[PDB]
Amino acid sequence: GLFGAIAGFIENGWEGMIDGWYGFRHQNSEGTGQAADLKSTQAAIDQINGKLNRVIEKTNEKFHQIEKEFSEVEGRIQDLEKYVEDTKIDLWSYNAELLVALENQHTIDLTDSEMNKLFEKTRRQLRENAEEMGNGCFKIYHKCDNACIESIRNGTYDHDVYRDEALNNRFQIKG
């Protein structure tokens, strides 16, 4: 949508991920692993539910109204009774049709947003120690065991601890 992460730079979703809406897959010293991110999953869910509750906020109640069905033909007054109701129905139908259209558009952009925000958040954390491979995967340039991967995920990763190892691996090489 607006941010270009979902159905954008992240090529596709993972049907495999069943424990949350956004998350990580790694490949490190002990192998490969997946894990849902629960903060962005909750952020997306809370917003969509907020949106959802506002739309289910109170049906107004109506009691005695006008007649809306007639068996004889009466002319002027009955023509107006029918017209008031038909122009009421068309106005409410328009409102329903535009309401879900705006809402839907916003939900796709909102979730695109959260994906991209998680990406940015992980980028910022990794600092000079990783490079964006451009498909939503960071190449981390230093030995990163499973506890290292877990510190990136739970947000305690200290970049300094690996900055020299990473900068050597990343730049120095032979050019």
Binding site: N12, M17, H26, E61, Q105, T111, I140, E165
Partner: protein, 328 residues
């Protein structure tokens, strides 16, 4: 730091989002079928088919319409002094007493319908010089001839119908609804046989208004043996006002007043079954759940109901775009 930290390996971390094999198409500002992880339906489109008898007071009219219940057609005597939040009128209802017509039937039905009560008080009208309690074989009350329970057909006594001039003060602190009428004879002979004068006249008035109706002699279609008709009229008398009924023939007199109230009552034509279940929204197709914001069951509704909409389905996406990883 350490000493020569030499283990030059790398790791890969990829971020991603879920996807479901199934998915649901929803409309958008820019596309009208875009597939999302999940959606929810906002249009309620199906009734239970039964009118739940709770929380509102549903009064099933059975084979009486509300006006016949009001007038007191013999077969509707069940309904006297009854009350309702919603009177349900059935397609099968039938009238079976003296042939009548009501000039603004539509407003009288409305008026009573939203008052919500048929509570009748009898008042001591004194008709001097005329015969009371007239009835007819077209309005059989039991074995006998009869008439509407709430109206009083006056005819001549001996050889005279005097000029009736009665009054009834509204001394209470509420409005009083009076239902009265006039009898249109089939023949001039009939007019004179019953009311002596060859031209009746009914004038009912208050300080604020007056109605004078004059009968209309002539044959109409045979309805329950009769070519005559009576037409029904109504007068509301406000607190402190006074009713004066003045007639010189053809008057169908009131027997007292219906008391009017102000509430949430209304009437609904429906042949749906009433059932014991609790439901706030009633549709002539049966009750429907007001959990969704819009409905497509019927434009006629009573109670806390979704807004009727022309559309039968409107799905609100509740999840991200679905970009599957195959689709299995």
């Amino acid at each position: 730091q350490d000493l020569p930290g030499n283990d030059n390996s790398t790791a890969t971390l990829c971020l991603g989002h879920h996807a479901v094999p199934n998915g649901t198409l929803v409309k958008t500002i820019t596309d009208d079928q875009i597939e999302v992880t999940n959606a929810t339906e906002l249009v309620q489109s199906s009734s239970t088919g039964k009118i739940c008898n709770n929380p509102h007071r549903i009064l099933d009219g059975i084979d009486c319409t509300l006006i016949d219940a009001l007038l007191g057609d013999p077969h509707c005597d069940v309904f006297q002094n009854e009350t309702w939040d919603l009177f349900v009128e059935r397609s099968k209802a039938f009238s079976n007493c003296y042939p009548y017509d009501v000039p603004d039937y539509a407003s009288l039905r409305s008026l009573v319908a939203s008052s919500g009560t048929l509570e009748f008080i009898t008042e001591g009208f004194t008709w001097t010089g005329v015969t009371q309690n007239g009835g007819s074989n077209a309005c059989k009350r039991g074995p006998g001839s009869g008439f509407f329970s709430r109206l009083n057909w006056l005819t001549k006594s001996g050889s005279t119908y005097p000029v009736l001039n009665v009054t009834m003060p509204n001394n209470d602190n509420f409005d009083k609804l009076y239902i009265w009428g006039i009898h249109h004879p089939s023949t001039n002979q009939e007019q004179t046989s019953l009311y002596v004068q060859a031209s009746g006249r009914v004038t009912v008035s208050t300080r604020r208004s007056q109605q004078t109706i004059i009968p209309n002699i002539g044959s109409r279609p045979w309805v329950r043996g009769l070519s005559s008709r009576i037409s029904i009229y109504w007068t509301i008398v406000k607190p402190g006002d006074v009713l004066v009924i003045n007639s010189n023939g053809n008057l169908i007199a009131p027997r007292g007043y219906f008391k009017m109230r102000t509430g949430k009552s209304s009437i609904m034509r429906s042949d749906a079954p009433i059932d014991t279940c609790i439901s706030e929204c009633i549709t002539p197709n049966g009750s429907i759940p007001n959990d969704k914001p819009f409905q497509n069951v019927n434009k006629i509704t009573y109670g806390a109901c979704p807004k009727y909409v022309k559309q039968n389905t409107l799905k609100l996406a509740t999840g991200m775009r679905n970009v599957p990883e195959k689709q299995t």
